[PDB]
Amino acid sequence: MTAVNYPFVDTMDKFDKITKGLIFTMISHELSILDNDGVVHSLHFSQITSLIDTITGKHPSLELPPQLFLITQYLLEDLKEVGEKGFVITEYFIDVLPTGNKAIFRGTLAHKISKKEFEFSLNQFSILQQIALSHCIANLHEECAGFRGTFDVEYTFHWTPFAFNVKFS
Amino acid sequence: MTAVNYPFVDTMDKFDKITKGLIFTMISHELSILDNDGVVHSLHFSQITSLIDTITGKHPSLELPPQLFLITQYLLEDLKEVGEKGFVITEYFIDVLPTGNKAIFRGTLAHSKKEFEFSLNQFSILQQIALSHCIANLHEECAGFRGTFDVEYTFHWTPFAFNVKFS
């Protein structure tokens, strides 16, 4: 019986003490998180995954273009409907406002010439949401890859089919 | 200017408070976890992902066949080397022993025939859960044997049958 030890013993020991604490037989699938203030927030495994995946950028939703990301995240049914009527976003601005946790999603729809303009004040645009949207901007082109994990910064992302830019305030 | 509110406000609130605590600008990428007794364990994002994904079954290493899973997990170089010599595992047993945190990975290699046996130590509840996901991913019939820990069983595998024998 060739005795073989696990390579990451110490790292494994941490997992054991945690997993052993989740036993109640089954695993609770829910981990408590302690913040700076000292408050425990009970989050399910799926929520912890989502929080980490968004901050790291591995979340599948962060591959979406910034506009499509906002549309999927804020349930912008009106902009889906105009897409089904032959309209496409020809230009859009995302104004991120850290104070107030808002995001102004404004732009111009065109048939391609009929043109409709839109404007949405996306509330609750927290730090997490600011990080996520920076991942969408960075995944559009390698030119914007440096703008990744940017939060608590007021900026406007201007997009056209010919140029994309981030202007700071 | 139409005002659109986020659907999951409260779920987001929890994230925000937590995310505020990781700010040092950049994020700490490390979360502090509290267990039942009241002990805090500060684990990195990568570790927490690995722990959660292992318990849920989403980890990529759990798709591997159970023997190839063990080989990769414990760095069983000897079984790779004999593989390079035209030998293949014709039969293998995995005896899970919860008391003592061991897994006996025994079996037979054939091209002459060399049999093998490994005592995989530190086979904890997390690893017992992982192995149950590999057994379940082998066939749909064995899917019920998922998330099994603290149970003494032997997994017998042949090319023509697979079985879980409980003790």
Numbering used by the authors:
A (entry chain B): 1 to 24, 34 to 121, 136 to 192
B (entry chain A): 1 to 24, 34 to 120, 137 to 192
Give excerpts from the publication.
To determine the structural basis for ChmB interactions with other proteins, we recombinantly purified the protein from several jumbo phages and determined a 2.6 Å resolution crystal structure of ChmB from the related phage PA1C (gp2; 38% identical to ΦPA3 gp2). ChmB formed a homodimer in solution, and the structure revealed an intertwined dimeric structure with the N terminus of each protomer forming a short β-strand and an α-helix that pack against the C-terminal globular domain of its dimer mate. Overall, the ChmB dimer adopts a distinctive U shape with dimensions of ~5 × 8 nm. NTS-mediated interactions define ChmA homotetramers that measure ~11.5 × 11.5 nm, whereas CTS-mediated interactions mediate interactions between neighboring tetramers. The distinctive U shape and overall dimensions of the ChmB dimer, at ~5 × 8 nm, suggest a model in which multiple ChmB dimers could line a hole created by the removal of four or more neighboring ChmA protomers from the lattice (two possibilities shown in Fig. 5b). Indeed, size-exclusion chromatography of ChmB at high concentration suggests a propensity for higher-order self-assembly that may be reinforced by integration into the ChmA lattice. Combined with our data showing that gp2 interacts directly with self-assembled ChmA, these data suggest that gp2 is an integral component of the phage nuclear shell that is directly involved in the docking and filling of capsids through an interaction with the portal. Based on these data, we propose that ChmB mediates capsid docking and genome packaging at the nuclear shell through a direct interaction with the portal protein. We next aligned ChmB homologs from jumbo phages that infect Pseudomonas species and identified two highly conserved surface residues: Q53 and A159 (ΦPA3 gp2 numbering). We generated point mutations of these residues (Q53A and A159D, respectively) designed to alter the ChmB surface and potentially disrupt specific protein–protein interactions.
The phage nuclear shell is composed primarily of one protein, termed chimallin (ChmA) or phage nuclear enclosure (PhuN), which forms a single-layer-thick flexible lattice that separates the phage genome from the bacterial cytoplasm. Pores in the ChmA lattice are less than ~2 nm in width, large enough to pass metabolites but too small for passage of most proteins or messenger RNAs (mRNAs). We found that one of these proteins (gp2) associated directly with self-assembled ChmA in vitro, suggesting that it is an integral phage nuclear shell protein and prompting us to name it ChmB. We identified a key protein, ChmB, at the center of this network that is likely to have multiple roles both as a pore for macromolecular translocation through the nuclear shell and for capsid docking and genomic DNA packaging.
